[PDB]
Nucleic acid binder design. Structure first.
Lengths: 51, 112, 109, 19, 216
RNA sequence: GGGUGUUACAGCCCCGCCCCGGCAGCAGCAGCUCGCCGAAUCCCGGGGCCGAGGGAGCGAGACCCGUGCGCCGCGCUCUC
RNA sequence: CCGUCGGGCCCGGGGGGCCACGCGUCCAGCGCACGGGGUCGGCGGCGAUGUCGGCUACCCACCCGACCCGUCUU
RNA sequence: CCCAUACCCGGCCGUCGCUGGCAGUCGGCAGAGCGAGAAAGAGAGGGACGCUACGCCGCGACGAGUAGGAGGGC
């Protein structure tokens, strides 16, 4: 059996560790959520520059 | 200590090693850990039935570390991408041998 | 109506000092003199055009005397603009120091 | 439940679970 | 029975849906929807009636055969591949042909065909290039655009329309649609000063001109 | 240029109270003022080399003889 | 008494995510695919007297390598 | 940043190991299986290839060599 890298190949990892799906479902919703809270401050910082 | 370069492996370093370079010694044959049944077929009598079970038994040195660690074939790493400082002398004196405590992780990221 | 290839020199074979690996050629593209500007040429198709005695068939043309050895720029070499290239046939040693063309058409822009 | 022998009577509610 | 709803959960990253399987369970409302539970043909003849067995046994057997190959999964035919495109190439872009007999000619890009090639056309009135397919790999994307969001290119033409048939003579169909789209871009390229003169000129490399060094 | 000296028409340093004085911000796109990292990590892209192996079966099943996208693994839709 | 983004499936009481879904009683089909090692259900050219192919084997050139074998001997 | 015959991934050859697998080609006297983490029973009241078994097949690991030894030489 050709050993496929579980780190690169996604579904090979889920074949070994099915929890890695939800590990990686988060750290996407989390990063995107942290990313918009980042720009909401920079958008509110400019609202502090003119004010 | 002139011949080895050891340290204290990080959790992530244990993950990448077991996953990318993890081969099991099944029936005295170096067999690639491609699915969990290969582990449970040999380490089932210690409740180690997946890669996570094996990684947990390795990282947090467990009651069955010996059998679990002896199940893994010795990791065949590649040469360190980026070079070495000096192979012949100890790490503290600007070389590479000896105990580089937590810096072993940087060396694993390059060899793995 | 004009030139559509870059000028490059067949510098030499990939070698150590007392061993040479003729399956890989070292190119010196004119104009580029640092690694950070070779990445434009990676993957580009390079050709060694020469002419021989007997006539050879020509794609889209009648038999002339010109022949080629096709290759491609594989990866950057060294630290000052040189670049490695692999050809379908190891370049002949009589090409050391002669012009080989570096086309643009495998383009990534 | 995951035991092959002594879990047989345990993973039978699952047969009625999708039903 | 029913018109199918689109896939409820949106893709987050390739292979990872946005909702977990328990949230997927309540989203499908599955909690309230538990479900519990040729070869013979008889023909008349003028005798009696005969029964023909269609697809009869083969009348020849080769001395040796090859065994059937194993099964792979990720290998699709070319017609089912996904068609990429550089982000620099957008409809209205001016390209530079590199390989075909129109070397160096600066042509205007219209659309990408299903086969993957670009439906490019320099105005035949300017650079002598008709409606022509071109592979996106062998073109340079110039950073000069024109707005062709108001051109209605015919849909009857496609990759099958430009496929080589079998001496080549230009069909009347090739001519009529040529002027059809050319009569809609030429009024647009002339709005940009010196643009029509830029399309007549060919691209070439001179002394000291280095492609990595220059932007286009 | 030289001397004097304590803010003067420049500044620098230390100490106490000022909510750690308050406020952005944060090992900083002032892309380089100084770190170690990732179960506290993920996404996307580009170049290079390779493609070894070749009967893995699925489903009507003894109320039927078909079919060569089949194992594991991920989650789509339908029988609301 | 104070502290802990503490531990107790985060003890118990008055907006976002869960590999959670039956009742009572006692104490199954259709597809898609990062999935057991590549395929195209994708194409283009040149080919009857000079072109095409011919690793090898004939000669020659060039780059790198390369001291003459047998033997006794550290 | 450069490169060793070292190390990593892949191909092929051979050797060694598993003292591995294959007699199951069990077909209208038919029923198409033993990849399965868990001492033991799918127990009764018209259909490619193959198996010179000294054959065929699958996994792993490994390969310097004088004196010398042994084996195999379609």
């Amino acid at each position: 059996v050709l050993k496929k890298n579980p780190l690169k190949n996604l579904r090979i990892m889920l074949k070994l560790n099915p929890y890695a799906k939800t590990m990686r479902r988060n750290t996407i919703l989390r990063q995107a959520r942290n990313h918009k809270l980042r720009v909401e401050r920079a958008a509110a910082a400019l609202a502090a520059k003119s004010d | 200590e002139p011949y080895i370069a050891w340290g204290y492996p990080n959790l992530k370093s244990v993950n990448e090693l077991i996953y990318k370079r993890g081969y099991g010694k099944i029936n005295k044959k170096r067999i690639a850990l491609t699915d969990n049944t290969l582990i449970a077929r040999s380490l089932g009598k210690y409740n180690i039935i997946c890669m996570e079970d094996l990684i947990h038994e390795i990282y947090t040195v467990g009651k069955h570390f010996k059998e679990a660690n002896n199940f893994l074939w010795p990791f065949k790493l590649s040469s360190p991408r980026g070079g070495m400082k000096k192979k012949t002398t100890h790490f503290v004196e600007g070389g590479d041998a000896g105990n580089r405590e937590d810096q072993i992780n940087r060396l694993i990221r390059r060899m793995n | 109506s004009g030139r559509l290839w870059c000028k490059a020199i067949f510098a030499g074979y990939k070698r150590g000092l007392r061993n040479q690996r003729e399956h890989t050629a070292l190119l010196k593209i004119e104009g580029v003199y640092a690694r950070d500007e070779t990445e434009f040429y990676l993957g580009k198709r390079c050709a060694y055009v020469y002419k021989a005695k007997n006539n050879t068939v020509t794609p889209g043309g009648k038999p002339n005397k010109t022949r080629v050895i096709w290759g491609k720029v594989t990866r950057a070499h060294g630290n000052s603009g040189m670049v490695r290239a692999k050809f379908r046939s190891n370049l002949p040693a009589k090409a050391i120091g002669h012009r080989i063309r570096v086309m643009l058409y495998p383009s990534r822009i | 439940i995951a035991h092959p022998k002594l879990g047989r009577r345990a993973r039978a509610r699952i047969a009625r679970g999708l039903r | 029975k029913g018109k199918p709803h689109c896939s409820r959960n949106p893709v987050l990253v390739r292979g990872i849906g946005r909702y977990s399987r328990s949230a997927m369970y309540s989203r499908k409302a599955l909690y309230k929807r538990k479900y519990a539970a040729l070869a013979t043909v008889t023909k008349p003849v003028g005798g009696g009636t005969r029964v023909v067995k269609l697809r009869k046994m083969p009348r020849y057997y080769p001395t040796e055969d090859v065994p059937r190959k194993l099964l792979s999964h990720g290998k699709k035919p070319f017609s089912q591949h996904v068609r990429k495109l550089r982000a620099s190439i957008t409809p209205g872009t001016i390209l530079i042909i590199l390989t075909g007999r129109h070397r160096g000619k600066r042509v205007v890009f219209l659309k990408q065909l299903s086969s993957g090639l670009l439906l490019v056309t320099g105005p035949l009135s300017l650079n002598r290039v008709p409606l022509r397919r071109t592979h996106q790999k062998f073109v340079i994307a110039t950073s000069t655009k024109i707005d062709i969001s108001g051109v209605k290119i015919p849909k009857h033409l496609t990759d099958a329309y430009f496929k080589k048939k079998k001496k080549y003579e230009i069909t009347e169909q090739r001519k009529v649609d040529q002027k059809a789209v050319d009569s809609q871009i030429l009024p647009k390229i002339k709005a940009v000063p010196q643009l029509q003169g830029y399309l007549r000129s060919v691209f070439a490399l001179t002394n000291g001109v280095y492609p990595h060094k220059l932007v286009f």
